[PDB]
Design a protein around this ligand. Structure first.
Ligand SMILES: Cc1ncc(CO)c(N)n1
Ligand SMILES: [Zn+2]
Ligand SMILES: [Zn+2]
Lengths: 515, 512
């Protein structure tokens, strides 16, 4: 029913930075009955200000730009002389920034110059869940050669970003952002999709993030998509991502043939100034790969992959995203937008998993990653897809090898195709396992996958399903914070403290009702 | 609850060794343009989904199996055997003739192939043509899955105790099924707390995929009600006799003893229960080992036995009288489900000393059960984080001599009440992959309340698909067919076929 206010059974708490004393990193805290002699349980919370009583929400003003000052203080950016140009959002009060000529701006660039930034301390704090460094947490799990710290320091965050084994998606023009980290050596994150009135649109974002969504993709097609994204980004505290191909496609009235470098370049710049934190770019869908998808059962199922194939076969030119890749990096690094190197060749049936085509694009994404790093741009890689359990590890091992350990961002894997209406379940099996194997992010799947558009309850089921999938994985990896919550909830079950059981759960209201 | 299952029709295949067997299947036909044969699906729903058969729950189902049992001539009528009462006049009650063989195990060992065995071999083949072999893609971790199942292969597996066909001779209504690592992963649904409504709960669970069903009823009339359930079930029925023995002494665990227990076994054995859950592995020495746990003892049967052990300070009388229990069971062909009263109820407690000490004990007991010629399977976790799941499998194959494994879940995390079907589907898929023969299902309302009809459906669908993902990954011969058929439909925009090839076509079609 409600989208705003405290999350039942919990209250919003902050921890302050030390390197950067003005940082206030968010958490939510669940207190248990006094008889238990237990401290309150600390839980990772991406809901942002919408679940903070102290802050009043005005979507026409947007969230407080708590991060603007920290970026400007680095003095690596300047106001943009004249920027590019459904109700219009009143964007009068916000300056639009771009890096100064020849200057460093991206999290990757700083980390490699040995600098630690506000975003990096923010994240190290966020990932520690207010645990006490002094107490030796004893480790139980299997991380398959991971490097998870007993406790996370900002310096370790700099190292990980330096070797490209983690990213902090943070467009300088997204001042509303509460920074988070994506990477194998951190807590597994999840992303939720949005898109097809304004209050209704922002609300779908508030909703996804209320239940655990770490980031959100605007997958909107059609008209007004730029103007509507204004209200979404101005009011989001999670990183926003897009597929700029969709917007470029509308600038040419929906005809793939008519795409070209110009409308694409312009769309990049609009979104960069608007605040998009990361772009999905199917730069790996190459001419010679398309023929490889003919012997498949389901063919090409990526909407971005389809668009590129349509363009390549009509012009018989090579994918212009792969050709102009360098000039794409030069734009993104001027804003600190991150790459989501997309997999237009992902398998849409378990029969097609791990075939030549998907693996050819994977190797090409690997090469592309290396190029992106030279320009100092942050990178993650997209993966499957539909994959039967027994092929899931293989997919992980290929990715760590040919993609140089960049963060992996999969959708599922769907572990079987026979349950339309239940794909959030088929995919939670694959997602849990692949997060265990080393995946950094999981794009969620709602029950209405392959069937229709998700209503607010489907979205919630999707989110909760993936939050628990991500957590199951954290437990298995032996992540130091995981077992606390598990043990906390299980003690309450044993002492019949029903109230604490509900509140310790991912979905108290539902737990309490069913009782 | 009855009639054909949307988008399919009931089909039958006939036995060769046993010409009068009719083994069930459902068939899904696709658009003519597709030039595909109809897809054959495993169907435990029974006669309730066959229009040609009239249902009268007061008469029960046709005892299509009585004749085959009697034809073996290894049984005799019982002189004098032991909520509305079920009119049981038309049904003779059987017991083994003195000194004779009756259990599937005994027969298999004697080199004999029985009706049940050919029934199963057929059922497990899904009407595939032995002609055209399928090409293997998967990973079965040292399993021995045939490209095609023959009755002889089923006799072999039963002989070595690596598979079981739960089939009490007094359950003539049964459509026999196989449980075993080397076959399709089966799933189990629970029932229990009017008659029409109780039988309905079992028709519903079986309609959606449940291969067997456990009556977990406690309280009064539990025996009389079970009459309605067994007489109308085409799937094996199981119980925990301890629950019924506990009501004979008004709910006081101290007051249990060998007598009321013995009497409960015999009642149910004559009634037709196909297998018993017996917590014979909850020994005096183990109980103290569960004190340093986070959740302690979470089995209802385990709790009962612990309560009895600590008040009398004698050893678990189920473990003491184990031999006299096998002697009763083998006289009807009841199968064992050696229970794990020491299962973990929190991830923290998984794979600890207590659960493993009971597991080794069930391994010993398994051996003894076989000498008495009684079929055995072992129960497992429980709550287990993914990283500990393979370990649990490797332990059981070693110390349990490869007997069929029967897990509940495992729940891979404790933090999601209201969604435990999801947390347990992750563990269930994996463990089935690793070698588990049967998965007891979990509904959304686990740890919270009692399952309504919708919950029970979600639970069953969730486990059917978990079991399938596992078959796919094990590289099972029949699994990929159905996956590829449903995907071709998706690729050709044959939306109607995509719905019908699904585990829940009505839901799929509504959502679209
Ligand atoms: C159906 C579909 N295809 C592709 C993508 C990404 O390009 C997506 N998010 N959804
Ligand atoms: Zn798909
Ligand atoms: Zn439990």
């Amino acid at each position: 029913t409600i989208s705003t206010g405290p999350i039942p059974g919990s209250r919003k708490v902050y921890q302050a930075g030390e390197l950067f004393p003005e940082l206030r990193v968010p958490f939510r805290e669940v207190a248990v009955h006094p008889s238990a002699n237990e401290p309150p349980v600390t839980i990772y919370d991406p809901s942002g200000p919408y679940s903070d009583p102290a802050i009043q929400i005005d979507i026409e003003k947007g969230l407080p730009r708590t991060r603007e000052a920290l970026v400007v203080a680095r003095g690596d950016v300047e106001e943009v002389a004249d920027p590019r140009q459904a109700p219009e959002f009143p964007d009068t009060g916000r300056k639009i920034y771009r890096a100064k000529p020849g200057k460093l701006v991206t999290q990757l660039e700083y980390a490699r110059a040995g600098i630690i930034t506000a975003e990096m301390e923010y994240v190290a704090i966020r990932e520690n869940l207010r645990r006490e460094q002094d107490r030796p947490c004893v480790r139980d799990g299997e991380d398959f050669g991971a490097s998870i710290p007993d406790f996370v320091t900002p310096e370790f965050v700099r190292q990980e970003i330096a070797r490209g084994r983690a990213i902090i998606p943070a467009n300088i023009n997204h001042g509303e952002l509460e920074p988070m980290a994506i990477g194998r050596n951190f807590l597994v994150k999840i992303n939720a999709n949005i898109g097809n009135t304004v209050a209704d649109e922002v609300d779908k974002l508030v909703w996804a993030t209320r239940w655990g969504a770490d980031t959100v993709m605007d997958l909107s097609t059609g008209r007004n998509i730029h103007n509507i994204r204004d209200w979404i980004i101005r009011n989001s505290s999670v990183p926003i991502g897009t597929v700029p191909i969709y917007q470029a496609l509308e600038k040419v009235n929906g005809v793939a043939e008519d795409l070209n470098w110009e409308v694409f370049r312009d769309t990049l710049i609009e979104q960069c100034e608007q605040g998009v934190d990361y772009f999905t770019i199917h730069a790996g869908v190459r001419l010679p790969f398309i023929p490889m998808t003919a012997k498949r059962v389901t063919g090409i199922v990526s909407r971005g992959g389809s668009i590129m194939a349509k363009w390549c076969l009509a012009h018989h030119k090579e994918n212009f995203l792969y050709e102009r890749f360098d000039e794409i990096c030069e734009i993104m690094r001027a804003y600190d937008v991150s790459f989501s190197l997309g997999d237009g060749l992902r398998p849409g049936s378990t029969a097609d998993a791990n075939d030549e085509a998907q693996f050819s694009e994977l190797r090409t994404l690997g090469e592309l990653t290396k190029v992106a790093w030279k320009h100092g741009v942050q990178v993650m890689i997209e993966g499957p897809g539909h994959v039967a359990m027994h092929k899931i590890k293989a997919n992980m091992d290929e990715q760590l090898k040919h993609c140089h350990e960049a963060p992996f961002y999969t959708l599922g894997p769907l572990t079987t195709d026979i349950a339309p209406g239940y794909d959030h379940i088929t995919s939670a099996i694959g997602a849990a396992m692949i997060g265990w194997f080393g995946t950094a992010m999981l794009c969620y799947v709602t029950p209405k996958e392959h069937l229709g558009l998700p209503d607010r309850d489907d979205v919630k089921t999707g989110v909760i399903t993936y939050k628990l999938a991500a957590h199951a994985a954290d437990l298995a990896k032996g992540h130091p914070g995981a077992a606390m919550w598990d043990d906390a909830i299980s003690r309450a079950r044993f002492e019949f403290r029903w109230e604490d059981q509900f509140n310790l759960g991912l979905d108290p209201e539902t737990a309490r009702k069913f009782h």
